[PDB]
Scaffold this active site. Sequence first.
Site, mmCIF file in Angstrom:
data_model
loop_
_atom_site.group_PDB
_atom_site.id
_atom_site.type_symbol
_atom_site.label_atom_id
_atom_site.label_comp_id
_atom_site.label_asym_id
_atom_site.label_seq_id
_atom_site.Cartn_x
_atom_site.Cartn_y
_atom_site.Cartn_z
ATOM 1 N N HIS A 176 33.045 41.422 39.666
ATOM 2 C CA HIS A 176 32.551 41.899 40.966
ATOM 3 C C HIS A 176 33.275 43.025 41.510
ATOM 4 O O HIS A 176 34.106 43.487 41.092
ATOM 5 C CB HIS A 176 32.543 40.604 41.947
ATOM 6 N N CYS A 220 39.815 44.202 46.053
ATOM 7 C CA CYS A 220 40.227 42.896 45.473
ATOM 8 C C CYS A 220 41.225 43.222 44.605
ATOM 9 O O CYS A 220 41.275 44.123 43.840
ATOM 10 C CB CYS A 220 39.015 42.252 44.743
ATOM 11 N N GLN A 243 33.044 30.471 46.650
ATOM 12 C CA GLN A 243 32.434 30.217 47.950
ATOM 13 C C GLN A 243 30.885 30.164 47.472
ATOM 14 O O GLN A 243 30.353 30.998 46.675
ATOM 15 C CB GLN A 243 32.587 31.622 48.648
ATOM 16 N N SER A 296 34.372 36.720 52.450
ATOM 17 C CA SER A 296 35.349 37.681 52.167
ATOM 18 C C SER A 296 34.798 39.238 52.470
ATOM 19 O O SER A 296 35.740 39.830 52.510
ATOM 20 C CB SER A 296 35.524 37.338 50.628
ATOM 21 N N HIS A 331 29.743 41.482 48.340
ATOM 22 C CA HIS A 331 29.775 41.643 46.685
ATOM 23 C C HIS A 331 28.612 42.212 46.145
ATOM 24 O O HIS A 331 27.612 42.078 46.468
ATOM 25 C CB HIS A 331 30.338 40.363 46.087
HETATM 26 N N1 LIG Z 1 44.744 41.598 37.372
HETATM 27 C C1 LIG Z 1 44.478 40.965 37.808
HETATM 28 C C2 LIG Z 1 43.397 39.915 38.418
HETATM 29 C C3 LIG Z 1 43.950 39.510 39.649
HETATM 30 C C4 LIG Z 1 43.109 38.578 40.323
HETATM 31 C C5 LIG Z 1 41.980 38.258 39.625
HETATM 32 C C6 LIG Z 1 41.167 37.149 40.411
HETATM 33 C C7 LIG Z 1 40.572 36.251 39.830
HETATM 34 C C8 LIG Z 1 39.936 34.967 40.371
HETATM 35 C C9 LIG Z 1 39.694 34.931 41.688
HETATM 36 N N2 LIG Z 1 39.198 34.035 42.154
HETATM 37 C C10 LIG Z 1 39.324 33.689 43.598
HETATM 38 C C11 LIG Z 1 38.544 32.462 43.655
HETATM 39 C C12 LIG Z 1 38.441 31.504 44.812
HETATM 40 C C13 LIG Z 1 37.600 31.890 45.933
HETATM 41 N N3 LIG Z 1 37.152 33.310 45.849
HETATM 42 C C14 LIG Z 1 35.800 33.417 45.724
HETATM 43 O O1 LIG Z 1 35.161 32.404 45.702
HETATM 44 C C15 LIG Z 1 35.087 34.753 46.009
HETATM 45 C C16 LIG Z 1 36.096 36.076 45.833
HETATM 46 C C17 LIG Z 1 36.320 36.510 47.193
HETATM 47 C C18 LIG Z 1 37.226 37.506 47.225
HETATM 48 C C19 LIG Z 1 37.736 38.113 46.044
HETATM 49 C C20 LIG Z 1 37.699 37.357 44.900
HETATM 50 C C21 LIG Z 1 36.802 36.454 44.624
HETATM 51 C C22 LIG Z 1 33.943 34.797 45.091
HETATM 52 C C23 LIG Z 1 33.724 34.873 46.498
HETATM 53 C C24 LIG Z 1 37.663 31.304 47.341
HETATM 54 O O2 LIG Z 1 37.484 31.799 48.292
HETATM 55 N N4 LIG Z 1 37.294 29.930 47.165
HETATM 56 C C25 LIG Z 1 37.007 29.020 48.143
HETATM 57 C C26 LIG Z 1 37.658 27.688 47.881
HETATM 58 C C27 LIG Z 1 36.307 26.965 48.507
HETATM 59 O O3 LIG Z 1 35.819 25.656 47.762
HETATM 60 C C28 LIG Z 1 35.518 28.388 47.902
HETATM 61 N N5 LIG Z 1 38.264 31.972 42.306
HETATM 62 N N6 LIG Z 1 38.772 32.803 41.559
HETATM 63 C C29 LIG Z 1 40.716 36.176 42.469
HETATM 64 C C30 LIG Z 1 41.034 36.990 41.954
HETATM 65 C C31 LIG Z 1 41.631 38.760 38.393
HETATM 66 C C32 LIG Z 1 42.026 39.677 37.840
#
Ligand SMILES: N#Cc1ccc(-c2ccc(-n3cc(C[C@H](NC(=O)C4(c5ccccc5)CC4)C(=O)N[C@H]4C[C@@H](O)C4)nn3)cc2)cc1
EC number: 5.2.1.8
Lengths: 145, 145
Positions: free
Chosen positions: A41, A95, A113, A136, A139
């Site tokens: 993303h 991010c 989310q 957040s 995206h």
């Molecule tokens: N080097 C390096 C590196 C560092 C970090 C990452 C990374 C990888 C994965 C994530 N991530 C975050 C999430 C969870 C999430 N978040 C989200 O659901 C969302 C999101 C919002 C903001 C930032 C990232 C994802 C999709 C909408 C979140 O807010 N989830 C809530 C709990 C409820 O039930 C929904 N899942 N995976 C975040 C960061 C990858 C590589």
Amino acid sequence: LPPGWEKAMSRSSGRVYYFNHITNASQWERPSEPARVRCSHLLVKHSQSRRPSSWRQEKITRTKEEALELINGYIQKIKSGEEDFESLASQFSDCSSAKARGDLGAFSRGQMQKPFEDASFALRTGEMSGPVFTDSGIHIILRTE
Amino acid sequence: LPPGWEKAMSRSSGRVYYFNHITNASQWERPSEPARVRCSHLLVKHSQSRRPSSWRQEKITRTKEEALELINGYIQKIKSGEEDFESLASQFSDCSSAKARGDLGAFSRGQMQKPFEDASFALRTGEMSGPVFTDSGIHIILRTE
Ligand SMILES: N#Cc1ccc(-c2ccc(-n3cc(C[C@H](NC(=O)C4(c5ccccc5)CC4)C(=O)N[C@H]4C[C@@H](O)C4)nn3)cc2)cc1
Ligand SMILES: N#Cc1ccc(-c2ccc(-n3cc(C[C@H](NC(=O)C4(c5ccccc5)CC4)C(=O)N[C@H]4C[C@@H](O)C4)nn3)cc2)cc1
């Protein structure tokens, strides 16, 4: 014809295009669920983001409408071939995934989310979303697997 | 007597101990506001969680009582030094922050649910919470900054 798609007319050009009400994607061409998907993303945060902060700026103050303009500019540049999705993510995504070219890894339903999840599961492999609004920020999503 | 800390008496031991009614921390030893804190957590969801789903399980069916037993079990392994907090968060957290050893990043007041926020701000750097109850489930919080 397929679930979520609308056939529409540009109100400026009269050009026919197709809009997906789950991914918010649009494309010129008439179009034709997985247990798990992998997505990259690009996030543009705004003043009403749940965490209006990122590696780019200690305090994010751009409005939601400014974030949407930025997203729409990235989408235009990606669709035109002028820019790569993953290179724009690496440079501009608000991010910690920006460093990993916006790769969030594989997930099933129940993790992301809901709006991001709904868009991700409705994408085809290799396909990009339109603007997806979450708590957040805004995206663009690239389904990679 | 730092914020939320109080002296009590162990019935069984006869010794004074210290309990924090904000973090649910407890310890034999006498202990001792920033814009932002950085915390890691381990979340255990139950069937009454706001969203009975995680990266670990599409459908979370464990009871609130079973979730609390797991949390108490993890606190025991952490305090005994059988398991690091990071190793248990990576393996068993119902939050995808498991990928980052439980690290939620830096946040200010206003983003997290009140019981989690209150606990997070009441911990000193390096300190760990007891079981913290939210609508999302039951947390162990570790303040890292
Ligand atoms: N080097 C390096 C590196 C560092 C970090 C990452 C990374 C990888 C994965 C994530 N991530 C975050 C999430 C969870 C999430 N978040 C989200 O659901 C969302 C999101 C919002 C903001 C930032 C990232 C994802 C999709 C909408 C979140 O807010 N989830 C809530 C709990 C409820 O039930 C929904 N899942 N995976 C975040 C960061 C990858 C590589
Ligand atoms: N790699 C990687 C990776 C993967 C995931 C993350 C991750 C990062 C951040 C979050 N997160 C979730 C939230 C929402 C928040 N949530 C909460 O307040 C709580 C919560 C519940 C469930 C999961 C996480 C936090 C504390 C109780 C919440 O529910 N807040 C409510 C709105 C009302 O005003 C209080 N904010 N950030 C979730 C996941 C980070 C890194």
